[PDB]
């Protein structure tokens, strides 16, 4: 009889499953913005008799690190990262986070910031002249301007801290941002140290990777498989509705 | 079902086919590109069940079940051929002919190697590549100089204002590989060496199987619309058939489970 | 329905920068006006299950699950850059070259 | 203090590039109809769901 | 969708192209005018490995 | 699959399959423009040499 609970248990994970995938198609189009994978896992419970029962539970094994494409906004505050390259930015609560949203604002007062995050380069939180022009050079110089001085008087005013983490040990955060796993600061300190070969380049912004096709497959399996499932709750249901005529005697 | 994630399989390797058709649309207007080109390759093939005896008084076809898993991209390859030349009058631009590369110097301490012969001079004389990266020969070109003349060979002279004879400023050779194919390739028109290609060799132009400058030509990209054309229409249409077949596998699917 | 409320919010994601498009669009014969450009962020995530460590060197997949929420527009940014200038030939037409703006 | 000239006669037109907006319009489309086909894919599954 | 967003800078290399042809051109007739040109470049390479 | 490859030691490889030829693994030299006749001879010429 208890059969049916492993059959729901199925529908429901993929239920949440399909959230992923709507998730994945909200935000199609946020820059620097990295799908959300998904995978189900079988769990074999053990016990007497014969173990036959496994139950199914779905899973994220964290993001993909597949660069998306990128536009070109020839916004000159724009920029996009290396094929593994991150942008770290200071935290709600402190910590330090890595992202790859390479949209960065000017407030009144010099601030520069991603999503409303001050943005931390060498040194801490950078901050450049009230209100000179911003120029971003290929590996983090920022050069500002002021305006009304002439063109010689460029100088530099700070430098961006570009990380290189592979993927497989940075874990997303519950606001969006990419944190160092346990394995990775073990391995790698408390924070990871701006390395040279990280290159980047203004003037474009990258935008999310997500890909339509793997999406509407995903959807199909999902919506075969929660119809299988129901057939089989129902078939289930069906099978044991006469056990208690059986019984009743 | 295995036939959905064969037809994922495929779709796949059509949009990346369509992605590097885009890209070598894109910079036709680019100096000293190469065109690419994606060679895909299939996966392994499932044997349900040996095929058995045969041939024995007998013309029965064989029956042996092999299944198929789909298909992959597993090179995309440059055409290191030789394009055409635009004229620009500019003294500092060199065309190149042959093979070969001008090595630049990147700004983290490697060295890197290109085609675009396109350069202009830095506020301290020394000849850099459009973006700021020095050419590592270093080619110091003074100040006060009438014109700047490179020959055929490597030797870049200037006039002075008196002086009848030119006086030579540096040399201008350039660097060969075993296999330029295997170079990596990077933005700004970049290439770094890999395993895959054999150690560099600098030598001075025309010899020793290098190329030849041309003073005031930039070499154009060997890119063939037409190809990229058909090309275009041969995968749109593999990508409506892939759509198709995904859709009757949905469909006998959904037919299954109303069961 | 989760999946509803999150297709939802995409929806209308797409709605509102279709309207700062034809926003865009309709008005591009005006004089001294600046493009827009709609900016959109995702929501918070829920971790339903927390991401245990193993390190038993099984090269097991991290097992942790975190469902998204959706996406919000969050700001919309007017580039201001120079455009181009056009002669009406008319004495009391002023054209800025630069930055800055009558009051 | 950096601020810009003035010419008479001239007026500053705007800085609409229609040829991204065409493309954005395009992706603003496809994407719309994605999301629709997500709402239906979810909407038949809970059919079938409260079928039984 | 990726092959979309390279067409766009394609068309925009172009219009920039077109751009700098129309300026020089216009003042054909401007004495001390030097003519200009632009120099393009490809973006940035994503690399894909396999075991 | 006509695709072949030259690898950096000048032995030709197709999918990396060292390809057989009357002989055994056929190796060119190590940069010579390779030219393939109607049938099946192999011309190797050293970039540069006359």
Sequence with gaps: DHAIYTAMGAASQTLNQQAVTASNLANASTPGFRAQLNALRAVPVDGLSLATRTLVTASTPGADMTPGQLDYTSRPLDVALQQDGWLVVQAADGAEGYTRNGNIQVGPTGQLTIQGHPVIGEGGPITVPEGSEITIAADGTISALNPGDPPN????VGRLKLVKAEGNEVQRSDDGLFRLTAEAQAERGAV???????????????????????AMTDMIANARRFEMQMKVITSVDENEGRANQLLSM | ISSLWIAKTGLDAQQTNMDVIANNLANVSTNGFKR???????????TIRQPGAQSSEQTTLPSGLQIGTGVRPVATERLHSQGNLSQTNNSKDVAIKGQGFFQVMLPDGTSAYTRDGSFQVDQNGQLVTAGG????????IPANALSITIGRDGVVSVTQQGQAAPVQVGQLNLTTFMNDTGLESIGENLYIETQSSGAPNE??????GAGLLYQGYVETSNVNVAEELVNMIQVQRAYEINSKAVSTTDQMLQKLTQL
């Design chain 1, 153 to 156: 008087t460029v100088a530099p």
């Design chain 1, 192 to 214: 990871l140290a701006a390395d040279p070969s990280i290159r980047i380049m203004s003037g474009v912004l990258e935008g999310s990777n997500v890909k339509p096709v793997e």
């Design chain 2, 36 to 46: 690419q080109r994606a060679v895909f390759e299939d996966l392994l093939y499932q």
């Design chain 2, 133 to 140: 990266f020095q050419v590592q020969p270093a080619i110091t």
């Design chain 2, 203 to 208: 030598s001075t132009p025309g010899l020793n």
